[PDB]
């Protein structure tokens with residue numbers, strides 16, 4: 065009954081090699097035979113990730129067709145086509161097709177193609193079976209198999225390491241940092257096994273081996289591992305619906321319910337009085353056509369696409385419309401430190417000498433830009449012997465070479481090379497000829513070279529060593545103070561240890577340097593502080609974002625000290641900020657987690673599950689978080705969040721393909737510009753949505769009043785479709801691209817639970833609809849003769865409705881600002897739209913085939929003057945209301 069239990073990474077880490085092998089029934093030397101691996105694979109399945117399949121585009125088209133409004137429109141179309149009204153039916157189906165095409169384009173998936181996650185997995189693996197090392201695919205691996213790891217070989221599964229010599233594994237897939245973690249074979253205590261990064265005896269799937277060789281026993285395959293859990297979380301997580309999308313859905317369902325109730329009561333009251341079935345069906349089709357605003361989604365999609373292109377011009381790639389729209393009104397921003405805040409380039413910032421001098425080094429990156437200051441004085445070359453000796457020791461004893469701003473070697477060594485180059489000592493290494501080399505190993509933690517001067521070979525040999533302070537100070541016997549060589553005392557070691565501890569508490573990496581004639585008689589020069597500094601201009605941008613309405617959080621993969629130091633540098637750890645680890649996050653209840661999340665801003669040692677839990681807790685109380693990252697765990701976090709902001713030209717492909725916006729030439733001012741553009745687009749969307757809703761309900765209630773008060777249909781489906789789609793479009797697009805005011809880009813972001821329709825907005829909409837209905841009814845009653853539909857009456861009604869809609873759009877162009885301050889032809893797009901609408905109306909009135917199609921007569925100059933003068937009535941009362949509310953605001957101020 066061979067039944068292997070699932071050995072977690074923690075439990076395997078605690079268990080020594082013998083018990084792990086006994087539980088897994090795995091032979092460390094001879095490996096597994098084919099029968100046992102076949103049976104285990106038959107039980108545990110394959111070591112493969114199933115990406116599954118998506119749904120075809122036609123299913124999405126059908127689902128978009130499944131809207132209740134689309135059913136109502138299709139019912140109206142089928143009723144029209146069943147009544148020998150093929151022209152009206154054709155127009156209705158054309159409008160329906162356009163509407164669903166626009167909706168599908170707007171709601172089209174951004175082509176995630178999330179198979180990049182299943183590519184940081186080796187296709188082959190060097191496994192040992194039946195005492196023979198065989199080249200097999202990783203998909204054939206099973207728990208209990210023995211896998212040999214080499215340099216450049218990607219870890220194919222979770223392995224319990226039992227043999228390892230100087231094994232450094234790149235773990236930038238679960239931690240997200242390119243710091244090779246040393247791997248050991250001894251079991252780990254349960255006290256330090258809280259974090260994944262502390263598991264030095266476990267080789268995780270998807271990680272790359274940088275140096276050394278090792279052999280491990282598989283403890284997990286496929287979906288029962290760390291990478292498997294990450295894949296499960298990514299696959300089972302979908303992008304939440306944006307607050308804009310939720311508001312649009314609520315408005316649509318409310319409109320559908322209202323229209324259904326209205327048409328039901330209209331049918332009931334018509335049947336109570338008694339009407340012909342043909343006329344009842346025609347009236348029902350009329351209200352069905354007038355109930356659905358067809359141009360609103362088209363205008364929304366067009367204006368959002370225009371904003372997306374404008375931000376693309378502003379160096380911001382956008383793939384989906386509503387997600388960036390809700391990002392424009394985001395509340396919380398979470399960003400990774402290693403890959404987004406810091407540029408992932410170790411730089412020396414603090415230098416401490418044996419004499420006791422403290423030196424601060426400016427500049428970021430592997431470039432000569434930057435100065436070394438001591439007591440406020442810039443030191444160049446060999447000006448200060450104390451600092452110069454440390455720089456020389458770090459420079460000659462260095463295997464790293466920096467070419468055209470790209471580092472080849474260890475990042476800490478590159479930091480020393482950059483520090484030397486900033487001081488003008490970039491060519492010092494060529495001046496010395498190395499005779500003996502002692503390398504940097506995880507067992508020794510120190511690097512030394514024996515070199516003699518190139519032009520002064522007859523000078524005695526000088527030895528330079530760098531490494532950890534504890535190991536370096538052993539070989540140190542003397543120290544230099546003010547040019548004099550003094551013997552090392554215990555007090556000197558004490559103060560050096562205190563300085564090292566102080567530097568370590570500030571998130572700096574402590575490296576010791578020493579020099580002397582022979583090993584064991586070396587002289588200690590001092591210590592250097594190496595940290596990952598933030599990018600340039602990042603602090604000012606973060607301050608600008610946090611100044612108005614944004615509370616920026618922080619998720620960090622390093623320990624508490626580095627996160628605290630980075631937050632203090634940015635300003636997120638001033639005096640009272642707290643740091644919470646992932647184990648604490650998973651410890652308390654979700655209610656306590658939601659209580660503790662908003663009052664903290666620093667997170668250290670966070671797994672992908674920890675980031676997902678933090679994002680869910682932030683979104684639980686109601687907020688629009690903006691997660692930012694560049695790693696696989698970061699990518700999972702962005703997938704969990706509604707909006708995903710990635711890092712361009714410096715992040716992984718998985719994060720780029722799993723995000724929403726790609727930030728080439730990574731800036732935060734671009735994020736601010738995107739937020740301002742989103743706010744302006746939301747304001748314009750509200751404006752033209754209000755205009756379209758007012759027009760739609762005005763037409764609906766006008767038709768209802770005409771039906772109740774017993775006149776025939778004034779407008780058919782074709783007239784309403786022509787008004788809504790062809791001519792009401794460009795004005796709404798111009799309103800969508802209306803220039804923004806100085807008060808829109810400012811002010812804290814709005815709460816996400818609000819609705820587009822407000823009390824004042826709906827009151828103005830109702831007033832405008834009532835005015836339009838009264839005008840249209842008066843015109844129809846005046847131009848009606850013996851209950852006979854005259855082509856002149858139809859033309860007058862059409863022109864009056866067109867003019868009223870145009871003037872309503874003009875009045876709804878802006879709120880609480882009138883048209884005098886903004887001025888006519890401010891953007892000239894509204895002027896072009898008005899001119900086009902006027903030309904189209906004139907063509908409809910005068911062109912003979914258009915007259916025959918629309919059943920309209922020819923108008924005179926007097927009729928045009930009458931219709932122009934009567935139309936401006938709504939504008940006067942609109943400006944009166946605007947002045948009234950302006951006066952109310954003035955007296956309230």
Ligand code: ALF
Nearest residue numbers: 240402620621695
């Ligand atoms: F790069 Al990280 F948490 F520091 F994903």
Ligand SMILES: [Mg+2]
Nearest residue numbers: 240402403695
């Ligand atoms: Mg990162």
